[model samples]
Target chain A: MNINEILKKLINKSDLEINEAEELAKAIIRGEVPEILVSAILVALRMKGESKNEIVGFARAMRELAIKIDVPNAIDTAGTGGDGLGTVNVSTASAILLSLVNPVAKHGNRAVSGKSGSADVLEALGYNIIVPPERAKELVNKTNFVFLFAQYYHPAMKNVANVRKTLGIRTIFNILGPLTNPANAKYQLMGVFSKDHLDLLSKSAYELDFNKIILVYGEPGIDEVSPIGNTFMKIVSKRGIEEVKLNVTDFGISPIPIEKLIVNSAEDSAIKIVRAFLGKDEHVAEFIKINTAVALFALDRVGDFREGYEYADHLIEKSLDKLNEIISMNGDVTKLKTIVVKSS
Target chain B: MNINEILKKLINKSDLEINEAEELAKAIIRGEVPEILVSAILVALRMKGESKNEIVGFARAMRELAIKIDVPNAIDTAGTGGDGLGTVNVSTASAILLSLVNPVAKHGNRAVSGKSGSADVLEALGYNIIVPPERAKELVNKTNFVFLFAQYYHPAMKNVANVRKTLGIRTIFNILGPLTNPANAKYQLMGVFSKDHLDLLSKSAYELDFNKIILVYGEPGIDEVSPIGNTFMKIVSKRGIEEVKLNVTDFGISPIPIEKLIVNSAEDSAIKIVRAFLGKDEHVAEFIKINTAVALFALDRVGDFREGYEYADHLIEKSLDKLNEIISMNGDVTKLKTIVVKSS
Candidate 1:
C-alpha cells in the first residue's frame, strides 16, 4: 500500500499489519515517499501508539536494507535512548567492558534526548564511529569491539533524518536503531526508555530471531541498568520469553544515586567513563560495572549475575586498554590518552 | 506557541486552547511553518479529533487573512463537500436560485471527493470562478450572486494546498472553507458531511458571530438537504442554537431516490443543473428547490418551509436568467448557452 493509504489507516486508529508496515518502511527507506508524508505517518503512528507487529515489521525492513558486517557470536549493547535523564553513556561504557569478554558490535547514533549517545561518547573518546563496513569488520576482528554507527551502517535512513530532526519527536525509528544492528548480533542487552516497551521490544527481538536478548527498562526513567532502583527486564531466548526485575544488590553491589552519573556533555560523559575505567570514580565505575555484568550474564559469558559482577570488576581497568586498542586501530589513540591523563 | 509544542499537545491527546490554535493557523497560512510539519499537525489533529474551539480559532485566522469584500446582507451556501455521493452541486445550484431572493457570496473550491465542486460546476457552466475581489463584489451588485473561489480570495491558503492534496483526507481546512467567507456573509446555509459535525459547525458559526446560520447533514451520506431521507440541522442565530430534522416532504414535495441525482462528471452535473434551472428535470429541480427553501427560510426571507418551497419553485426558471447574467458579467455567456442547449 502507498503512504497515503497507510496514513489513512493510522489516522483512523487502526494498527497496520506486519507486512503492510514492512512495505511502508521499505518505501520510507528507499526515499519513495514524500518527506511530508513520512512526517505525517510518523506522527499518526506515534499518536496511535505503535504496536509490536508494526515495530517488528519496521525493524525487518531496516535490517534488510542495512549494510551488513560479519561478526560471529557477537553481542550488542544498544538502547532506545530518549529517557532524558542526562546520565553518562552507561551502555557505551558497558560495551567497552563487555567487549573484553566477547565480541561487541555496539550499534548507536548521536544524541536524541540525552547529552550524549553511544556514538557521541565514543566520538568524544576519539573513536572514528563512521568507518566503512569492511573496516568495521576488521576492527571487530582485531579488538573484539566495533561501534556500528547507525547513520553509517544504515545509509538509507538519511531519507527521513531531516524530518526526524525537524519533528523532534520519538518515533518508531528510535526503537528500530537497536533492532537493526548491522552485524546481526546474536545476543543483545537492549534498553527501552519505558517499562511499557519491554514486552514490545522483546517480542520484536524474538520475531527477529535473536538467539538471546534482554530488554531492560531502568528505574527512575533511564534506559539502562539502574544503580538506584530495580530495573524491569524481559528476557527473550530460543527457549522462550521470561520477565524479571533486577537491582544492584542482586549482583552484590551497593546502590548508587542516579545523580552521581549525570553529565553535561559528551566530553563530560567521556571523562566520567575514562575515570571509571581508571578506577578513579567508584560511583560511575559501579554503575558501568553493574550494566556490563548484566550484558555479560545476558550473553552467558559468566555463570550468574554475581559472578558476572565480579568478572566485570576484575576487567574494569583492562577496559581502558581495550578502548586504546580500538582507538589506535580505527581512530586517534593519542586523543584517548589525553582523556585518560585528564581523568587522573 | 510553536507548531512543535502544539503537535506535542495533540500527540498527547490534549486539546489546544483557542488562541494556541489561532497562532498555529496563522503560522501555517503565512508559510512560516514547514510543509512537513503542516502535514503532521493535520494528521495529528484528525487523530485527536478536532475541537470546536480549534475550528473557531482556525477560521478566525483564515478570515483575518482573506481579502475582504463588502456586500451587505449577503448569504453564502458552501459545504464541506466530501460526501462522495457524486451528486450535482446542490449548494451551488441552490445558491443560484436563492440569489433571486437574496444576495449570495458562494465560497468553494474544486472537487475534493465528489465529481464536481461548486467551482467546477460553475466553471463548466461558463462562470470565470476566479475573479478579483472587486469584480466579485461587482458581480454580487449586478446579479445578486458571486462565486467566491476559495483559492482566489484566500491566497495564503496556497501554503498548505499541496500538503492537503497529498494527504487526501478530510482535515480542518475542509470545514473552514464554509466558515471563512470573504464578504463576512451574515447568513449561511452550510452543509456538513456527517451528523457528528452539526453541533461543531453551528457552535463555530456562533463563535464567529454569524447573524444566522443553518448547518445540515443530509441523509444517505450527502451534505445538503436530502430528498430521500431526513436532514439533520443545527440552527445558529444571535438568539442561540437549536437542532431540528427536516425532510423534503415537510416542504410539500414527494421524495426522490438518491440514485436519480448522481452524475458522472463536472460536465454531467453542470448539464443537470442547467436542466433544473430551465424546468426540464423535476427531480433535480425539487432537490435544488428544497435546499434553496431551507436557505430562504433560514435567512428569514420566507414565512415558512412551505412558503419558501413555493417561492423557490416560482423562482427556479428565473435562475437561468441569473446564471446567464453572472456569466455575461465575468464569464463566457456563449459557453453557458452551449451547456443550456446541450441540456435539451
Candidate 2:
C-alpha cells in the first residue's frame, strides 16, 4: 500500500499490518518521508497505542536496514527512555554489570532532549561510544562488554535524526532504538517508559525471536526497574511470556522518591555511576543492582530477580575490578581512572 | 512552548493555544522542526480534528510569513483535494468562470498525488500559473484573473512540501493552503473533502478574519459541488457562520452521476474546462456553474446560491468571450486557443 493509504488508515486509528508497518519503517530509513509527517506518524501511532505486531514489524524493518555488528553471544540491556524521571542512567550501569554474568552488548544514543542519555553518561565515564562493528564485536569477545553506538550501527537513523531532535518528543522511534539492537542480541533486559508499554515491547521481542528476555516498566514513570513505586516485568522465552511485578516492599526493601534519583547532567550521572560501581552511594547502588538483577534474570543465569539481585550484589562488590578489567581490555584505563578519581 | 511540549500536550488531547499554534507554524516555516516530527505533528493534529483556533493561528502565521500579493478586491476558489474523485477540476474551472463576475486570484499547487490538481488543469489550459506577485496583481487588474502558484507566493511551504508528498495523505496543510492565500482575498469559495470538514474550515476561515466565505463539502467524498449528492455548506461573514445543506434537487435540477464527471488526466480536465467555459459540456458546465455560484454568493454578488446561480448562468453564457478577453489581457488569446485546441 502507498504511504498515503497507510497514514490514512493510521489517522482513522487502525493498527498497521506487518507489511504496512514495514513499508512505513522502510520509508523512514530511506529518508523518503518528511520530518513533519514523521513526527505525526509516531505521535498518531502512540495516541492510539502501537500494537505488538506493529512494533515487531517496525523493529524487523529497522534491523533489516541497520548497519549491524555480529556478536553471537551478546545480550543487551537498554530502555525506551521517555519516563520523564531524568534519573541517572540505570540501564547503562546494568549493561556493564551484566557483563559479570554474560557477554553484554548495549545499544544506545547520546542525549537529544534528555538530562543525560546512556551514551552521554558512558562518554563522560571515559568510554569510547563510537567503535566500528569489527571493534565492537572484539570488545564483546575480549571483555564481554560493548557499547553499540546507535548512530554507528544504525546509520539510516541519520535520515530521521534531525526530525527526532526537532520533534523533541517521545516517539515510537525513541522506544524502537533500544529494540533494534544491531547485534541481534537474543537475551535482553528491556525497560519501557510506562506500565501500558510492558506488553507491547515484550510481545514485540518475542515476535523478533528473542530467546530469554525481560521487558520492564517502572511505575510512577521511570525507564528502569526504578527504586520508586512498583516495577512491572514481562519475561519472554521459548516457553512464552510470563508477567511479574516487583515492589520495593515485596523484597523487604524500602522505596525512595523519584527526586532522590534525579541527575542534572552527564557529569552528575557519570559520577553516580562510577561511585555505585565501586559499591559506594547505597541508593544509586541499589538502583543499579535491581536493574542488573533483571538482566541476570533475562539471561537465565538466575531464576528470578530476587535470586538475580543476590548475585548482582556480589558482582557489585567486585564491580571496580570488573570495570578496570574492561577499561584496560578496551583501551587505556588512565582516562577512566581519572574520571573515577575526579568523580569520587 | 517547545515543539516537544506542544506535541506532549497534543498527545494528551489538549488543544494548543492560538499563540502556541502560531509559534509552531512559525517554527515549521523557519524549518526548525524535523520532517519526521513535522509529519507526526500534522498527522496527529489531523487525527484529533484540528480546532478552529489552531488552524486560525497556523494560517495567521503562514500569512504573516508569506510573500504577500496585493489584490484587494480579489476572490479565490480552491478545495483540499484527496477526495479521490478524479473529477474534472471544478474549482479551477469555477475560478476562471468567477472572473467574469469578479476579480479572482486563485491559489493552487500542481498535482503530486492526485490525477489532476487545479494548477495542473490551469497549466494545461496555457495559463501562466507562476507569475511574480506584481505580475499577478497586474493580471487581476487587467483581466480579473490570476493563478498564484503556491511555491512562489508561499516559499515557506518548502519546509513541509517533501513530508507532505512522502506521507501522500491529505493533511491539515492541504486545507490551510487555500486559507493562507497571499492576496488575503476577502471573498473565498472553499471546498473540503468531507461533510464534517465544513465546520472545521469554515470556523477556521472565520477565525482568520475572512470578510465573506463559503466552505463546502460534497457528499460521497468529492471536493466539489457535485451535481449528484448533498453538498454541505458553511457561509461565513462578519455575521458569523451559517450552515446549509444543498441538493441538486433543491434547485429543480436532475442529479448527474459521478462517472460522467471523472477525468483521467489534466489534459482531459483542461478540455472539459475549456468546453465548460463555452457552456458546451452539459455535465461539466453545471459543475462549474454550481461552484461559480458559491463564489458569487461568497463575494455577495447575489443574495444566495440560487440567485448566484442565476447570475453565474448569465456569466457562463458570456464566458467564451470573457475567457478570450482575459487571455488577450493577460497574455495572448491565440496562444490560449491553440493550447485549448490541442488539449481538446
Candidate 3:
C-alpha cells in the first residue's frame, strides 16, 4: 500500500499483516515511501505489538530488493543482532577462518546503528570491498570469500535512507538487516542477540528454505553462542530443526571468562581469529575454534557438533597454510558497476 | 531522544526502551516530533514488537501532553477505538444520561480512519463542533455536556495531518488518542475494543489518579459494554484497580436486533439518541438505556448496574428539560484566542 493509505488505516486501527510490514520496509529502504509516511508507519506499528511473522515477512521483502550475488556453494555467516553485548567481529572472524577451509560469501552490510558492525570490520580487512551484483557473483564463485556490501544490494533503500537515518535509533530494521541475504545462501550459521531468540531466527531460516542452518545466541549478551559461556545452538536442515543449548564445556578445557574473550577492534578480533586458526591455545582462540566447529557442522563436514568440533580444530590449526593461501588469493579489487549516488 | 538517533539506531540494531516510546507519543501530540520520526518510530517498534510496558508508557506520555480542560467533576468516556464490532454509540448516549445528574466532558477527536467516530455523531447532534480551547472550556463550565474537539488541543499534530489523511489506515496514534484525556476527568467509563486491553487501560487509569473509573470492552464488537454480549469490566479507584468479566445477560437484556440499532448516518445515530433521551419510541433508545445504566454505575450514581438502571430510567423519563437547557450553552468562538494558520 502507499504510505498515505497505510498510515490512515494504522491510525484508524492496527490490523496490518506481516506482508504489509514487509512492503513498508521495502519502500523505506528503496526510498519510495516519503519522509512523513515513513515515520508514521514505524510509530503506529510500535503502538501495537510486532510478531515474528511480521519481522520475517519484512525481511523477505528487503531480501528481494537487495543486490543478489551468486554464491552457489558458499554460505552466509552473520549475526541476527540485538545482543546488548555489542562485541567486535566474532562472526566476521569465524567467517574469515571458514573461508580458508572452503569458499565463503561473507554477506556484509554497513552499520545501521551499532557501536561496531561486520561491514565496518571487513572494510578494515585490507580488501577493496565494493563488489556490485555481477562482480559479487564472480568473486564468490572464484575465491574463498566475497564480502557482499549491503548498500550495493539494497541501493533502493536510499529513498527512505535520509528519513530513517534522521530518526537514528534502533527499530525493527536493525535486526532485520542480517536476514536479508541477496545471495540466498543454502547454508548459514547465524547468531542473534537476546537469550531466547533462536526460535525466531530458526523459523525465519526454515521459511527461507535454508538447506542447513545453525542459529545461535548466548545468555551472556553475545549474538553467537557464547564462546566463553555455554553457547546455545539450533541446527536447521532438510530433516527440520534440532535445538541444543550448550557451551564450549565439552572440549575438556576450562571455560574462558566473558572478559578474556573481549577484543578492542575488528583488527584485534581478526588477529585473535588468525591466532586460533594457527593453533594458538589462547583465550579467544578457543572461542574461535568453537565457532569454527559450528561452521563445519553447518556445512555437513561432520554429523554432530562433537565430530564437527574435531574437524574444526584440525582445519584451523593444521589447515592454516591452505586457509591463508585462499585469503591471499581473493584479496583483490575490481570495479563492477558505476552508479553515481555519493554515500558509497 | 531525537528521531534521527532512533532511525539510525533502528537501522544499526540499537535497543528501544518503553520511555522512548512514551516520549514519542507526547511529542507527536504536542507537535514536537516531526512526521518522519513519527512513522519511522512506529515501524521500528512494531517490527521489534512493542512490549506492554512500552504501550502503557506511551499512554502516559499522551496523557501528560494533552491539553488539560477544566471540567467540574466531569468524566472522559470513550474506548481506545473500534471494537471491530460494528455497533451504534453506547458511551456517547451513556455520557448524556449520566451528565443529566452530573457534569461530563465527552473528550473527543475525529476518527482518523474509522467509519463512525464519536465526534461525527456529536456533530450530528447540531453542535457547532469545532471550537478553540477557551470556548470549549466555557461551554463545559456552562453546560452539563461538552465535547472537547481533539484537533484544537493537539495543535502540533497538524504537521502530520496530510500524512494521516493520506494513509487512511490505523496507526499507533489512533490508540493513544483515546488513552490521553485532555479534560483529566476524575471519573470515566471507558469501553475498549477487547478484553486484553482491560489490564492496560486499568493500569493507565490507576496511574493517572482517576477518582472512579470503569473500563469495558463491549463484547460482540460494540464499542460500549454490549447489552447483548458479555461485558468485560475493570475499575480504578484510590487504592487499586479491580476487574470483573461479565456478559451482557448480567444486565437483564437480550442483544438488540442489529437492524434496530443500525445508524444510516451520523445524524441517524444522534437522532436515535435524542429520541431515547426524550423517552420516545425507538429501538436504538434501548442501547442508550443499557449504556446509560452502566455509565451511572461507573459514576457511583447508584450501587450497581441493577440500581443504576433505575437511576438512568428515572433521569430519562423527565430529564429532557434539563438536558436541553444544559446543551444550549454553546461555544462563543469570538471570545477565544485562535491563531488560524490559513493554508489554501
- Every candidate's DockQ is 0.69, 0.46, 0.30
Worst 10 residues of 2 chain B by lDDT: B326-335
Q: Where is the poorest 10-residue window by lDDT in model 2 chain A?
A: A248-257
For model 2, how does the per-residue alpha-carbon lDDT over A1-344 read when each residue is reduced to its tens digit?
A: 46667767778899888888988998888898756566667777877788977898889999999988776578888788776668888888877777887888898888755669988887777777888888877878788898888878888878987766666666677678778889988888888877777777887878888888788887677678868778888888888899887786554457866675789999888788788877568788888888887788767788766787788888888777777787776655787788788767
Candidate 1 on A1-344: residue-level lDDT in tens? 77777888888889889899999999999999988889998998898999988998999999899999877489998988888888999888989888887899999889856658888999999999898887887888789999888878899999988999899888888778888889999899998988888877888788888888888988887778888989998889888889888887997878898888999999899999999988889999998888888788888878887888889898898988888888998888888998988899
Among the candidates, what TM-score does chain A have in each? 0.96, 0.92, 0.84
Q: Write the residue-wise lDDT of candidate 2 on B259-326 in tens digits.
A: 87889987778788777765567888887788887788777778777887778788888776766776
Consecutive 10-residue window with the lowest summed lDDT within model 3 chain B: B335-344
lDDT of 2: 0.79
lDDT of 3 by residue, A47-144 (tens): 44445666777878887877676665788788767555546566776776677667787777655334356776555444556766766666555656
Q: Judged by DockQ cut-offs, is candidate 2 incorrect, acceptable, medium or high?
A: acceptable
**What tens-digit string does per-residue lDDT give for candidate 3 at B32-84?**
76656655655555454445556677767766655676774888677777654
Better of 1 and 3 by DockQ: 1
The lDDT values for all models are 0.87, 0.79, 0.65
